[PDB]
């Protein structure tokens, strides 16, 4: 987690694998899924 390189296309597509990964909420930033850690 903590900014994974997957290259997003929007914040709802980041959400789905970042929340399965183990992070909290999702939020794309600079074409990269950034997420909030614990």
Sign of the alpha-carbon dihedral angle for 11, 16, 33, 13: negative
Rounded to 5 degrees, φ, ψ at 14 are: -80, -45
Residue 33 lies in domain: 1-38
Place of tokens 């914040």: 11
DSSP label at 18? H
Q: How far is CA 14 from CA 27, 37, 38, in A?
A: 7, 14, 17
Q: Is the CB of residue 10 less than 8 Å from the CB of residue 26?
A: no
Residues preceding gaps in the chain (C to N > 2.5 Å): none
**How far is C-alpha 22 from the chain's CA centre?**
10
Length of the chain: 38
The pair of structure tokens assigned to 29 is 């930033």
Number of structural domains found in the chain = 1
Q: How was this structure determined?
A: NMR
């Amino acid at each position: 987690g903590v900014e994974i390189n997957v290259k997003c296309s929007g914040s709802p597509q980041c959400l789905k694998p970042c929340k399965d990964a183990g992070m909290r909420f999702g939020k794309c930033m600079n074409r990269k899924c950034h997420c909030t850690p614990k």
